Amino acid sequence: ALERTGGNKSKAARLLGISRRTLYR
Description:
The chain is mainly alpha-helical. The chain has 1 helix and no strands. The termini are far apart. It is classed as de novo protein.
């Protein structure tokens, strides 16, 4: 079963991880 909901949420989670790394070197 494919759930459309949460699909974009996962993308944001990954984006945040990269964002955190940029802020903290």
